[PDB]
CSV table of C-alpha atoms and ligand atoms in Angstrom, one decimal:
chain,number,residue,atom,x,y,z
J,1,UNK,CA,0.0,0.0,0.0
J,2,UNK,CA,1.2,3.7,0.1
J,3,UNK,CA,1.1,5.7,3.8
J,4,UNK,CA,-1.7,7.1,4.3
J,5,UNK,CA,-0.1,11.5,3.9
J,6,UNK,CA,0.6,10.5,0.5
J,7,UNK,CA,-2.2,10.1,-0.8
J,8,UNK,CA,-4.4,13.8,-0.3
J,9,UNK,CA,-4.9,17.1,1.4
J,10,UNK,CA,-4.7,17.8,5.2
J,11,UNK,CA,-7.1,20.1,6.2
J,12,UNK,CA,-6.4,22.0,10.0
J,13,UNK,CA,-9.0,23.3,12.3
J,14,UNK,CA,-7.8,25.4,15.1
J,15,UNK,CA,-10.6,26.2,17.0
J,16,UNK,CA,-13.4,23.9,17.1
J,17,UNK,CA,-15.5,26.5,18.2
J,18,UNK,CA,-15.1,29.0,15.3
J,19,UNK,CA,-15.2,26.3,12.7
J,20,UNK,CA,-19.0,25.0,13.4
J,21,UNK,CA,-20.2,28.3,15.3
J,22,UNK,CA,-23.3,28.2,16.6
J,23,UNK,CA,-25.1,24.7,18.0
J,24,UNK,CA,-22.4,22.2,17.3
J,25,UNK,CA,-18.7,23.6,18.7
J,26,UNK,CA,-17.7,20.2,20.6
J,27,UNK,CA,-15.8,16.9,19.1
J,28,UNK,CA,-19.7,15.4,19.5
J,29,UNK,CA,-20.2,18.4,16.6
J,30,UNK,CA,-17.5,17.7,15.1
J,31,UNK,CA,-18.3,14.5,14.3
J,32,UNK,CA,-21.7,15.8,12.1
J,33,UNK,CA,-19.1,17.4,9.9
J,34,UNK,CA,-17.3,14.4,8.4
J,35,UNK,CA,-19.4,13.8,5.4
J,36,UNK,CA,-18.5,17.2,4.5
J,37,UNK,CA,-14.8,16.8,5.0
J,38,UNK,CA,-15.0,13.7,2.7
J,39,UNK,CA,-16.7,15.8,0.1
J,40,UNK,CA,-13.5,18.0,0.1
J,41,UNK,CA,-11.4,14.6,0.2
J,42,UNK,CA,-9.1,15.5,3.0
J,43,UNK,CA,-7.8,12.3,4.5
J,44,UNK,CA,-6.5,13.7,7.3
J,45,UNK,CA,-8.0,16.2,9.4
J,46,UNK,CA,-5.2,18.5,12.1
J,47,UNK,CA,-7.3,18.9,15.2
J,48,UNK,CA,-6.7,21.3,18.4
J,49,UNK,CA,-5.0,21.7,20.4
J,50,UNK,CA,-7.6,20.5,23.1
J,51,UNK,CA,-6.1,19.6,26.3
J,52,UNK,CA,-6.1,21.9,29.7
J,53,UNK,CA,-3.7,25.0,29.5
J,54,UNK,CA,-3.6,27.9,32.1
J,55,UNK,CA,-2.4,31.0,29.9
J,56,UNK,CA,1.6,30.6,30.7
J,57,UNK,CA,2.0,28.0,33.6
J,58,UNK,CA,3.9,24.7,33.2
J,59,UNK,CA,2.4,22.9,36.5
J,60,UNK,CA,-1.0,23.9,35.3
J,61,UNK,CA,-1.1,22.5,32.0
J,62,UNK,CA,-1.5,18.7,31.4
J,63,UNK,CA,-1.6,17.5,27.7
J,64,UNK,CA,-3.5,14.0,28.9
J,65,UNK,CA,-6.6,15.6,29.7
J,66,UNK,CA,-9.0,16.9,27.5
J,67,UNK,CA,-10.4,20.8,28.5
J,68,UNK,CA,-14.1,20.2,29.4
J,69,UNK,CA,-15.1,23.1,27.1
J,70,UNK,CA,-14.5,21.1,23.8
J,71,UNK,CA,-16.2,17.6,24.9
J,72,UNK,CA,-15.3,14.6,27.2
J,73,UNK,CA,-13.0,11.5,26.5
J,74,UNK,CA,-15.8,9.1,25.0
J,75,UNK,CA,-16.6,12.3,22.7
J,76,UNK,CA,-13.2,12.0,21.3
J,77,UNK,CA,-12.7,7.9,21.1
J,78,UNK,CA,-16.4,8.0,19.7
J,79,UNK,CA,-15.1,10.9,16.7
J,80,UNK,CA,-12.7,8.8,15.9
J,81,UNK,CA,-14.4,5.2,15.2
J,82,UNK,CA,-16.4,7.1,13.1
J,83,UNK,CA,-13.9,9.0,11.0
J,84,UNK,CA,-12.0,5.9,10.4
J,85,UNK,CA,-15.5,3.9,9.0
J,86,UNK,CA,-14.9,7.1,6.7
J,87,UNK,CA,-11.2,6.7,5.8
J,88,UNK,CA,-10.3,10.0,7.8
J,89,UNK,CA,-7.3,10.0,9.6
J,90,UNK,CA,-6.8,12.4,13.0
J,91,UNK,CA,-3.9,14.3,13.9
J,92,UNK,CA,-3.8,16.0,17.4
J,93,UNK,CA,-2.5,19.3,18.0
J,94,UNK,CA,0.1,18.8,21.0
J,95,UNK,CA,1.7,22.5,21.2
J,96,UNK,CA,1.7,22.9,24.9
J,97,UNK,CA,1.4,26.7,25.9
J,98,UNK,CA,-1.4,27.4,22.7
J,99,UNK,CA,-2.6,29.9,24.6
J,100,UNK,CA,0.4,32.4,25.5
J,101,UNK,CA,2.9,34.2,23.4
J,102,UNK,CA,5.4,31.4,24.0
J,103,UNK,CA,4.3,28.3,22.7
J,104,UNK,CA,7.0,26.5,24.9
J,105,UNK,CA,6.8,28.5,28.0
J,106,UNK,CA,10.5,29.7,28.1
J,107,UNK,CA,13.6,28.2,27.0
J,108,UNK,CA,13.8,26.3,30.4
J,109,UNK,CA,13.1,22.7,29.0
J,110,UNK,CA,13.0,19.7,31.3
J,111,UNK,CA,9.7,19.5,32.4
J,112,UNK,CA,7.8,20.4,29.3
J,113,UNK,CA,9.7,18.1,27.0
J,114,UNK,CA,8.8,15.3,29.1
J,115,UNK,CA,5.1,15.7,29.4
J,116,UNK,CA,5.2,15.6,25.2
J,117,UNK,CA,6.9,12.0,25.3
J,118,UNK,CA,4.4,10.7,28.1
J,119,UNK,CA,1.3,12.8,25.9
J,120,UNK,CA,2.7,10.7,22.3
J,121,UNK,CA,2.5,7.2,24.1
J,122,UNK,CA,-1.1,7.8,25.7
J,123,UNK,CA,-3.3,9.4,22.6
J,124,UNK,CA,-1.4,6.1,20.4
J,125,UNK,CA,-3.0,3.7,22.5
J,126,UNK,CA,-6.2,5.9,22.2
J,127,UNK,CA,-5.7,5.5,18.4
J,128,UNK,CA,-4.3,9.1,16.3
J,129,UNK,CA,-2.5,8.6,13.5
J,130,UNK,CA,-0.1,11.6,13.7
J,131,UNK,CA,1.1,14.7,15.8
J,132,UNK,CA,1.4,18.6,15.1
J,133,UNK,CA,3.5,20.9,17.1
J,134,UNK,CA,3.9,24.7,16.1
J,135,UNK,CA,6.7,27.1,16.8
J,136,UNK,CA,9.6,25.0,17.1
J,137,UNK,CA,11.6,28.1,16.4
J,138,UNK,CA,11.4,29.0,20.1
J,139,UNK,CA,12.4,25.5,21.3
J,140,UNK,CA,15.6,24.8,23.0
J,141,UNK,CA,17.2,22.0,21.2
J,142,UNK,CA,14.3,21.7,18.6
J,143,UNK,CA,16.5,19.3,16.4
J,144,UNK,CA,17.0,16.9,18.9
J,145,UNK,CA,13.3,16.8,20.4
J,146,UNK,CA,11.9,16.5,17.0
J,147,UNK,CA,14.3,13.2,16.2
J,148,UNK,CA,13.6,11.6,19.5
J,149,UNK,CA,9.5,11.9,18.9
J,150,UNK,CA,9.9,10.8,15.5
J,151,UNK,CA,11.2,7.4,16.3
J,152,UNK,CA,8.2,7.2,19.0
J,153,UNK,CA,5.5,7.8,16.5
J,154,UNK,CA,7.3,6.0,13.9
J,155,UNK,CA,8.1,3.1,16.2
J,156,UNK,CA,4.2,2.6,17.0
J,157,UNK,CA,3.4,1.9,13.5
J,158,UNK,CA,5.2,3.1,10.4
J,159,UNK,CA,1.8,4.0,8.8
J,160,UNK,CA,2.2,7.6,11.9
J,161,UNK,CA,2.7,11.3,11.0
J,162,UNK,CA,4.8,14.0,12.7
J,163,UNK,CA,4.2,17.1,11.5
J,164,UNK,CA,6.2,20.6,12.9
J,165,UNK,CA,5.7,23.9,12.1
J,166,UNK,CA,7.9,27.1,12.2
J,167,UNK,CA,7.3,30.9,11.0
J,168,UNK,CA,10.8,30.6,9.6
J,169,UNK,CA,11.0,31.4,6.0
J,170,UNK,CA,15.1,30.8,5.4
J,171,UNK,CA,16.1,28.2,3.6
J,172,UNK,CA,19.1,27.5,5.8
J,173,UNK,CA,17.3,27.9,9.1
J,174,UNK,CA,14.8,25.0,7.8
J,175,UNK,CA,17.0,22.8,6.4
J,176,UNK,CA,18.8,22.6,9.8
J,177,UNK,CA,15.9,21.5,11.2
J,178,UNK,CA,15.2,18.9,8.5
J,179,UNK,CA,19.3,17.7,8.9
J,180,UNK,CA,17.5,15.7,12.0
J,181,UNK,CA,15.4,13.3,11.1
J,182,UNK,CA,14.7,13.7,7.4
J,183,UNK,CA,11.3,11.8,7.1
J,184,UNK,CA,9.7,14.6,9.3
J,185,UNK,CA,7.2,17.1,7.8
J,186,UNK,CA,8.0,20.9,8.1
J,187,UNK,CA,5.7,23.4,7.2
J,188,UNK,CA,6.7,27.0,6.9
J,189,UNK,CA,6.2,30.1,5.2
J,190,UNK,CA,8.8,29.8,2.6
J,191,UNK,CA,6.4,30.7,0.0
J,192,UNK,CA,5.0,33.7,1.1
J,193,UNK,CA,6.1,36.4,-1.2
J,194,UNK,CA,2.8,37.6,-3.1
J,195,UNK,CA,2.3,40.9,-5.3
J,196,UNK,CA,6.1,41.8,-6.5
J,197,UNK,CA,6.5,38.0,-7.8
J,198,UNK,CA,7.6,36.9,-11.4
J,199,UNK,CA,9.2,33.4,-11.8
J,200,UNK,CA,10.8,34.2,-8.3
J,201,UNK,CA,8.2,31.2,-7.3
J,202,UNK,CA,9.9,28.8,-9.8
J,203,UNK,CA,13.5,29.3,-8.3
J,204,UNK,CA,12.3,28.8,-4.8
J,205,UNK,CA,10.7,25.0,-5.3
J,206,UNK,CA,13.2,23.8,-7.5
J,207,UNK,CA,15.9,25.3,-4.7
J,208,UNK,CA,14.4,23.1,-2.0
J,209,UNK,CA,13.3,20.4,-3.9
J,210,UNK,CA,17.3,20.9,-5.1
J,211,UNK,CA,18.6,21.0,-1.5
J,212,UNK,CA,16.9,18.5,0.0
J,213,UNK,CA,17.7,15.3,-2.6
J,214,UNK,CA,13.7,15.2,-3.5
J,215,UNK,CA,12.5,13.5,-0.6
J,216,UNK,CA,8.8,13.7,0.5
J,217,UNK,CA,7.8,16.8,2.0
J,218,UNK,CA,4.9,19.6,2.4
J,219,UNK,CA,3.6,22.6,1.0
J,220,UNK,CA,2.0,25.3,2.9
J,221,UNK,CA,2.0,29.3,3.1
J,222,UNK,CA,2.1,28.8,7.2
J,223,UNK,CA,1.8,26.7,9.6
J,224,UNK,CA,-1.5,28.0,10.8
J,225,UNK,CA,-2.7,31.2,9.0
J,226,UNK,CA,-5.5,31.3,6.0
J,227,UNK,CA,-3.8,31.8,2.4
J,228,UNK,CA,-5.8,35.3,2.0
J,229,UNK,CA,-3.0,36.4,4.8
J,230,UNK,CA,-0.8,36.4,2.7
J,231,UNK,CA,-2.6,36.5,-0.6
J,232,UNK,CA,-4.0,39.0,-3.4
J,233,UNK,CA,-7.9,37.7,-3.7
J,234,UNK,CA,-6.9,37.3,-7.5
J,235,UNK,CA,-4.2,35.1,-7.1
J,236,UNK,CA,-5.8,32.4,-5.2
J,237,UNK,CA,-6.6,29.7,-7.9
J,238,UNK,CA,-3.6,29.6,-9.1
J,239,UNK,CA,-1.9,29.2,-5.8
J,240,UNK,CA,-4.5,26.2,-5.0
J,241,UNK,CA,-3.6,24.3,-8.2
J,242,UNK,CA,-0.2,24.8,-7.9
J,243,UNK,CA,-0.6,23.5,-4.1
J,244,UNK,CA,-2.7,20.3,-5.1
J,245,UNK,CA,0.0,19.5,-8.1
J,246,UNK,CA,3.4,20.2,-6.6
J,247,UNK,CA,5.4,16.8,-5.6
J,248,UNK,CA,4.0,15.9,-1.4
J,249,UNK,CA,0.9,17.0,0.9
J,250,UNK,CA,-0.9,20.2,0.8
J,251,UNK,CA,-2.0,21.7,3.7
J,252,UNK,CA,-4.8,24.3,4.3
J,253,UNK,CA,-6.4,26.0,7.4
J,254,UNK,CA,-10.3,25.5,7.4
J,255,UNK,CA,-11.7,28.4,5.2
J,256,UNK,CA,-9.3,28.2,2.3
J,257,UNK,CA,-11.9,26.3,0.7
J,258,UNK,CA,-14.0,28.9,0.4
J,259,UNK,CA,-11.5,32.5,0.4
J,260,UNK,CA,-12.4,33.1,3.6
J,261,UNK,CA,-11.2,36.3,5.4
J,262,UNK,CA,-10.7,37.4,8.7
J,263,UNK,CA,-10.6,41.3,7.5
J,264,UNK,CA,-14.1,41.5,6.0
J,265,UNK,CA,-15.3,40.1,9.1
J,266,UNK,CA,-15.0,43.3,11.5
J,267,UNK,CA,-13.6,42.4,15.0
J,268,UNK,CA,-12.7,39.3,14.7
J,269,UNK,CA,-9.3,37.0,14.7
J,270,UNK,CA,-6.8,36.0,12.2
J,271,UNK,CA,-6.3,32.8,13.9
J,272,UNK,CA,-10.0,32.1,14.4
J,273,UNK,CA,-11.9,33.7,12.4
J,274,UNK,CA,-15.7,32.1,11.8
J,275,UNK,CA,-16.4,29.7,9.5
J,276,UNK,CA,-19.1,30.8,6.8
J,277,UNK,CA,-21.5,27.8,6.5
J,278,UNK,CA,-24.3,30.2,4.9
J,279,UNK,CA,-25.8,33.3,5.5
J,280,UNK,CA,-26.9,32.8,9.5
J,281,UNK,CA,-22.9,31.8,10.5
J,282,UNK,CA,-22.5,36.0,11.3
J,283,UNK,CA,-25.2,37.6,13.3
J,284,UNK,CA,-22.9,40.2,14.8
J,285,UNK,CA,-23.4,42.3,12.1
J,286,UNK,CA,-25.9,41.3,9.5
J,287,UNK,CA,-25.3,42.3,6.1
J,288,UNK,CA,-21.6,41.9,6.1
J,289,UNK,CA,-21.8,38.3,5.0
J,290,UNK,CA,-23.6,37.5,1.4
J,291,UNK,CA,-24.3,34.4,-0.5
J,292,UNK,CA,-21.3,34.0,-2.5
J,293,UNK,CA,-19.0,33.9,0.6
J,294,UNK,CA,-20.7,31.2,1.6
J,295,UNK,CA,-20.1,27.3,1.5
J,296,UNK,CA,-24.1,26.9,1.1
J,297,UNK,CA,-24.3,29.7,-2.2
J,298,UNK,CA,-20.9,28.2,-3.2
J,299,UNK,CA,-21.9,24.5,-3.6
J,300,UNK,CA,-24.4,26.0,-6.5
J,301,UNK,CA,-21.8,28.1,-8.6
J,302,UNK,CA,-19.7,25.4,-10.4
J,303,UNK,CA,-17.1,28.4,-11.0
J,304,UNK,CA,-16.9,29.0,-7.2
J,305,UNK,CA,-13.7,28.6,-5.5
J,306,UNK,CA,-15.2,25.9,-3.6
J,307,UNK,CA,-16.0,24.0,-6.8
J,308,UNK,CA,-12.3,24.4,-7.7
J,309,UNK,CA,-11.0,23.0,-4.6
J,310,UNK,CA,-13.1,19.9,-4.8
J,311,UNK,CA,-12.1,19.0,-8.3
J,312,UNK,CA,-8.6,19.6,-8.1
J,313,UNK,CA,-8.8,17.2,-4.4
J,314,UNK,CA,-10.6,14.9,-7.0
J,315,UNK,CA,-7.8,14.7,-9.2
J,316,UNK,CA,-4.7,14.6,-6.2
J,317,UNK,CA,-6.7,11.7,-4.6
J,318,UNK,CA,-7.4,9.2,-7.3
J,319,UNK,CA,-4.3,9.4,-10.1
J,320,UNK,CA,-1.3,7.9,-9.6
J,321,UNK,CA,0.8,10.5,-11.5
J,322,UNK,CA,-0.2,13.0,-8.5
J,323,UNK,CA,0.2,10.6,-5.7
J,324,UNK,CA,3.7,9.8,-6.5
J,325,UNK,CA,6.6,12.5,-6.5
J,326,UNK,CA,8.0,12.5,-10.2
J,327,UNK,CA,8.4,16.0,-11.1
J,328,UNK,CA,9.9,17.8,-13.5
J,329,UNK,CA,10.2,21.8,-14.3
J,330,UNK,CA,10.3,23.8,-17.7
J,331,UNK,CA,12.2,27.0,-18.4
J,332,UNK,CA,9.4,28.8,-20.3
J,333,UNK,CA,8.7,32.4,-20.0
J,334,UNK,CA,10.0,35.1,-17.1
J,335,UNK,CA,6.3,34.8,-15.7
J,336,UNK,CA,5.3,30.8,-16.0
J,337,UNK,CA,6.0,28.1,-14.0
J,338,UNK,CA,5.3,24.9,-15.9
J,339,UNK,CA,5.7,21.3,-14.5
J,340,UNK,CA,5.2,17.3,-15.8
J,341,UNK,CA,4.1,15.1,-13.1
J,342,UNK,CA,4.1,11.3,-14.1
J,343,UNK,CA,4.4,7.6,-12.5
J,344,UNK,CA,5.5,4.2,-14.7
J,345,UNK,CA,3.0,4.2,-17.8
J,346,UNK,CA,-0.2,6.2,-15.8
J,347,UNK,CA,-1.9,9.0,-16.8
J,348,UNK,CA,0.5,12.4,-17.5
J,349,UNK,CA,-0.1,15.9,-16.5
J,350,UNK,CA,0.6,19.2,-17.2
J,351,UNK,CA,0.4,23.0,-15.4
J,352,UNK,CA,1.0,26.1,-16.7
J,353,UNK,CA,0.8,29.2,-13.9
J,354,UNK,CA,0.9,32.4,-15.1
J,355,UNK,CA,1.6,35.0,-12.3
J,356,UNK,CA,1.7,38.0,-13.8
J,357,UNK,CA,-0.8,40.8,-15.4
J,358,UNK,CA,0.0,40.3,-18.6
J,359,UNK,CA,-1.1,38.0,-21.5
J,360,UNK,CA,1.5,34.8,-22.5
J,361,UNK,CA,2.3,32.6,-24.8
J,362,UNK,CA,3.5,29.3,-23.1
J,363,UNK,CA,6.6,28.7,-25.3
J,364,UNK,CA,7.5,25.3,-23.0
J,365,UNK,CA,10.1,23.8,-24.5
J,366,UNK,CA,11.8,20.1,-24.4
J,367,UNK,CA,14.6,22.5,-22.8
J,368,UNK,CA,15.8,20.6,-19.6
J,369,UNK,CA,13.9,17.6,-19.1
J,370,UNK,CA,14.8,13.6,-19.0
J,371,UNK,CA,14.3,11.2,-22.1
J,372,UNK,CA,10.4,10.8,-20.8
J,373,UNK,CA,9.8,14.1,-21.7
J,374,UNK,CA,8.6,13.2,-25.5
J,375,UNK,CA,5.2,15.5,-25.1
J,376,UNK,CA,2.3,15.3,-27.4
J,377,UNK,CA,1.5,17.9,-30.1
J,378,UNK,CA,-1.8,18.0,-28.3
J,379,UNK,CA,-3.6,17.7,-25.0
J,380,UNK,CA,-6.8,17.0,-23.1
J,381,UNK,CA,-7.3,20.3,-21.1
J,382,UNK,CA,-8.9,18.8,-17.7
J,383,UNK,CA,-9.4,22.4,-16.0
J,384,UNK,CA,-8.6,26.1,-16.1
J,385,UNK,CA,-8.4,28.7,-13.4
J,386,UNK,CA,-10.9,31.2,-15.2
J,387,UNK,CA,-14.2,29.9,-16.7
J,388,UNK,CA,-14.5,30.3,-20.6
J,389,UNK,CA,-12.6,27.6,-22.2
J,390,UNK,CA,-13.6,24.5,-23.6
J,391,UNK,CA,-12.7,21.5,-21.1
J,392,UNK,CA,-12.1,18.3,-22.3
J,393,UNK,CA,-11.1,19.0,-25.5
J,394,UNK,CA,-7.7,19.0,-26.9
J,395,UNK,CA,-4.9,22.2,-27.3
J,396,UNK,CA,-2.0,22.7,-28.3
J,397,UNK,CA,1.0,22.9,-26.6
J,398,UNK,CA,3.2,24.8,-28.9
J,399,UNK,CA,0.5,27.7,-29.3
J,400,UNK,CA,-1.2,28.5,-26.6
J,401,UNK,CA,-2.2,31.7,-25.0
J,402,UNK,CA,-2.6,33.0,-21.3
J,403,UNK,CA,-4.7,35.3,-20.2
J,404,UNK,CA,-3.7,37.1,-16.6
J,405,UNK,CA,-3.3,35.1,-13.8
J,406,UNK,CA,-5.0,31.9,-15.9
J,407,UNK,CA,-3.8,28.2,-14.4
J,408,UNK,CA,-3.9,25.3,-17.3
J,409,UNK,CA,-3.9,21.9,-15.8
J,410,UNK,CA,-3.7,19.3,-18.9
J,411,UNK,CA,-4.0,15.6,-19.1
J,412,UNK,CA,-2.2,13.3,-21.3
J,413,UNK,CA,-1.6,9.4,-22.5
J,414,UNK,CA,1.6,8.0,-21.8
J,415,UNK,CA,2.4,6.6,-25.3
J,416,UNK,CA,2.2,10.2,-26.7
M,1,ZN,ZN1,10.5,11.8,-14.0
């Protein structure tokens, strides 16, 4: 079989209380939501944290117990029986002090690295398939924590996740993290450089996908904010298929879905901001919220950004090309960023990104790719970021125009 990260999307939810508002808000709630998580084909869900945590006190903080406001213990065990009878897999949120400015309390150790090793052996027994921990930057000793937790997870089953998180965005300072144990996920906000772009993205994937010998890894804007944080509202389809075809796991906050905001929303956190189910999700202030921002009004536009999320999770989920990590990079025009993804003789596929406000033409050429590069004359376009074109039906590659800001995604045969 493959491990079960390979193979789609993680989607995190912070606060359980801002992602099902009103009614629901516990892990019993929670639980209502699943069919609607497998509609997005996430197969793995990064929940809390959700254990007791006195703002900024060591002693009164214990990771083994559950805080009363989000549920009980049979809550949790019962979310979980569920969610795998729907092949959803759980990660828990272990980051200790989640609700001070120091996610680690201070750089004095000891005590709080221990209560993390007896936290990892307990909620394994209890049945998660994975970890998250946030702002290893401030961690004394991160390197060496995150190795020795590995081989805990890893040593329960193979088929277990750890997953850290930094703010970080230099190179260097991340791959000095990853110099530890190197089958460890990092996500990071490496790629968060919007407006003032160009093929500056291009450079930056093929640099760590360079540095770190290709091996299996994530790709993220943070390790907790929304995309529209960092994000023009224009640019965000093409950021989501670049996201769901680049070699290893996306990972979203709940809301990218949708676009959702926390400015827009007056008063209310970045972190947390509430999830827009349909138009009775924001009392507060009535009019502010409108159909289209909606997960309700968009499930009936098929050119919503919701609809684009789905299909594109669609496509990451069930071909093989985009579950394994062969990859391969053009050198087209100073805007684009094309890529081949393909695996033994599957289905091929192709992307073109243009980032920039002007209109292309993709000029990808052969130029720097291995002897399975041999690409059609034509082929099948599956999707594109602005409605318009004829889907399904064949292009060509040699002439092909893009309009600003336009994402291609195109299907091939392998015998071309
Ligand atoms: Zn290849």
């Amino acid at each position: 079989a493959q491990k079960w990260w390979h193979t789609g999307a993680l989607y995190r939810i912070g606060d359980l209380q801002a992602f099902q508002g009103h009614g629901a808000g516990n892990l019993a709630g929670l639980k209502g939501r699943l069919d609607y998580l497998s509609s997005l084909k996430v197969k793995g869900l990064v929940l809390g944290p959700i254990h007791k945590n006195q703002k900024d006190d060591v002693a009164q903080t214990d990771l083994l117990q559950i805080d009363p406001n989000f549920g009980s213990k049979e809550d949790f065990d019962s979310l979980l029986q569920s969610a795998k009878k729907k092949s959803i897999r759980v990660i828990l949120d272990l980051t200790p002090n989640y609700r001070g400015e120091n996610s680690w309390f201070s750089t004095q150790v000891d005590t709080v690295a221990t209560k993390v090793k007896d936290a990892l052996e307990f909620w394994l027994q209890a049945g998660v398939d994975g970890f998250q921990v946030r702002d290893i930057e401030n961690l004394k000793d991160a390197s060496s924590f995150l190795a020795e937790w590995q081989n805990i997870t890893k040593g329960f089953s193979e088929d277990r996740l750890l997953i850290a998180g930094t703010n970080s965005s230099d190179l260097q300072q991340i791959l000095s993290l990853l110099e530890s144990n190197k089958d460890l996920l990092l996500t990071s906000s490496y790629l968060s450089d919007s407006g003032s772009t160009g093929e500056h993205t291009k450079s930056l994937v093929t640099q760590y996908l360079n540095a770190t010998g290709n091996r299996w890894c994530s790709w993220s804007l943070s390790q907790a904010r929304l995309l529209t944080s960092f994000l023009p509202a224009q640019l965000l389809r093409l950021y989501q298929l670049m996201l769901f075809t680049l070699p290893g796991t996306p990972v979203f906050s709940y809301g990218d879905e949708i676009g959702l905001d926390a400015a827009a929303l007056p008063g209310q956190p970045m972190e947390a901001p509430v999830m827009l189910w349909d138009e009775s999700s924001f009392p507060d202030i009535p009019g502010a919220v409108s159909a289209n921002m909606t997960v309700k009004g968009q499930s009936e536009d098929p050119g919503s950004l919701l609809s684009l999320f789905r299909r594109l999770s669609d496509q990451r989920s069930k071909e093989r090309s985009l579950l394994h990590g062969d990859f391969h990079a053009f050198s087209a025009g100073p805007g684009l960023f094309s890529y081949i993804r393909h695996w033994d003789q599957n289905e091929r596929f192709l992307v073109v990104l243009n980032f920039g406000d002007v209109g292309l033409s993709a000029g990808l050429q052969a130029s720097d790719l291995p002897a399975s590069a041999s690409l059609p004359a034509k082929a099948d376009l599956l999707l594109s970021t602005q409605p318009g074109r004829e889907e399904g039906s064949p292009l060509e590659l040699e002439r092909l125009k893009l309009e600003p800001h336009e994402g291609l995604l195109l299907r091939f045969p392998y015998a071309a």
